Amino acid sequence: KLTSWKNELSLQALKADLDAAKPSHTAMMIKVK
C-alpha cells in the first residue's frame, strides 16, 4: 500500500518487536533510575 515492496511491513509486526525488547529496556532503566 504505502510502498511497492512485496514484503511491506505491518504495524503489528513493528510493534511486536517493540514490546519484545521492552522488558530488557525496562530493567536497564531501573538501574539508571
Place this chain on the structure above:
Amino acid sequence: KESVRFFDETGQATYAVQTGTTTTEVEVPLANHPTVEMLNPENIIIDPSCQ
C-alpha cells in the same frame, strides 16, 4: 554570467542581450543543515541481541 554559462556548455563566445522575462517556479533552499540531539535513554530502545 549567461555568456560564461554558455561558454562552459559549448565554448562559444556569445553576447547576451536582455529582451524578455517570465514567471518561473523555483524552490528557494532554507534550513538545509544537519542536526544533532541527545536522546533520553528511557525514550529509546535497542535490540538486546546485539551482543
Place this chain on the structure above:
Amino acid sequence: QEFQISDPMRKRVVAYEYWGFWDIEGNGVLEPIVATWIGSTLIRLEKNPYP
C-alpha cells in the same frame, strides 16, 4: 502534563521511529528501512536515505 496549545498546527504529539534492517524482498536479504507511526497509524515507510 497540564500544558497544551490551542492551535492545531502547533499541537504537540508523540511520534515513534523504527530504524533497522528488514527483509523487504522475498529473496532473503536485509535492507535498512525507516518507519514512523503516530497513534497506531502508519504514516512513513521508506529505505534509509542516509548514505
Place this chain on the structure above:
Amino acid sequence: GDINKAMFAIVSFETCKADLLKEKDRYHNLNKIDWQSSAPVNEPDHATTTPQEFQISDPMRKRVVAYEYWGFWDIEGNGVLEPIVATWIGSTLIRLEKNPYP
C-alpha cells in the same frame, strides 16, 4: 599448554537465518532445521546477555545458537591430518570444509 598444539576447538555463538544467507553456498541442508528448537532459551550451556524471554517474530531474524568445530582431522586414509571447519545447528550438520584461511 600451547594453543598451537591443540587439535580441536569448539565455539558456540548466536546467528540468524539472514546472517547465514549472506553466504549463498557455504551452508547446505538449511531448510531441514526448525527455528523454534535450538533457541538460546533451550541452550543452557551457552552463556549470553540476551534475555531468556526475548524473541523475534520474524523467522528471518530468529536468534539461534550455532557450534563451530575448528581443528585438524585425518580426512584421508593415508594418515595425514588436515585443518577443517565444521558447523552444526540442532544436531544437524550444515557445513563441512577445509580451513579457508591461508
